[PDB]
Ligand SMILES: NC(=O)C1=CN([C@@H]2O[C@H](COP(=O)(O)OP(=O)(O)OC[C@H]3O[C@@H](n4cnc5c(N)ncnc54)[C@H](OP(=O)(O)O)[C@@H]3O)[C@@H](O)[C@H]2O)C=CC1
């Protein structure tokens with residue numbers, strides 16, 4: 632119903648995951664930022680929806696499942712029912728959005744956040760319309776097995792700043808990263 636957004640942490644080499652997990656050691660403030668961005672609703676009495684592929688859901692520690700204070704939807708064409716803890720199961724990205732306009736959720740949901748698989752990002756990315764990409768740039772190489780798709784700079788513009796998002800280089804466990812926001816409308 633509100634805004635459609637993607638959120639991702641990528642290494643210098645475009646890597647997002649290795650063996651079902653993150654390619655770098657745990658970065659707690661990066662995690663806190665993920666949580667803060669997906670969780671904050673811009674409107675009273677509304678909640679954000681988080682859309683993720685099946686392998687992303689299973690990579691969140693069980694004790695954090697479902698992500699608290701968010702509506703959790705899992706995408707899969709193989710599952711019959713949402714996995715244990717999940718609220719909704721959709722067979723495609725169109726259906727997950729079509730569901731949003733269902734009287735059920737229609738008045739409950741503010742923003743919609745895509746929190747991954749590459750598969751999921753690739754598709755959201757080509758979706759027609761207004762979209763924002765929140766990209767945490769991890770500034771080093773990390774051996775990965777799953778990568779984020781290439782951002783087309785002829786369609787996405789890097790914003791010079793964004794309210795509530797730090798513009799300076801962060802550092803944790805001696806890993807430098809920075810937060811970026813890109814916008815499209817076509
Ligand atoms: N650094 C970061 O920001 C992020 C890192 N990660 C990490 O990346 C990896 C997760 O990877 P990835 O393989 O890309 O997995 P996804 O989470 O995208 O899982 C893909 C599975 O999900 C379902 N699916 C995906 N896209 C769709 C669609 N459009 N319609 C329907 N079903 C879909 C299918 O399930 P089925 O086979 O059941 O049909 C497919 O097998 C892990 O290593 C994880 O830890 C994940 C997200 C963000």
Ligand SMILES: CN(Cc1coc2nc(N)nc(N)c12)c1ccc(C(=O)N[C@@H](CCC(=O)O)C(=O)O)cc1
Nearest residue numbers: 638639640662663665666690691695698699746767
């Ligand atoms: C593999 N993923 C995707 C993921 C991790 O880091 C990211 N960072 C960004 N910037 N985007 C993403 N999509 C992710 C996730 C794994 C676990 C949790 C998780 O445990 N989340 C808790 C917060 C835990 C904390 O305190 O860090 C939550 O409430 O979101 C989230 C995402």
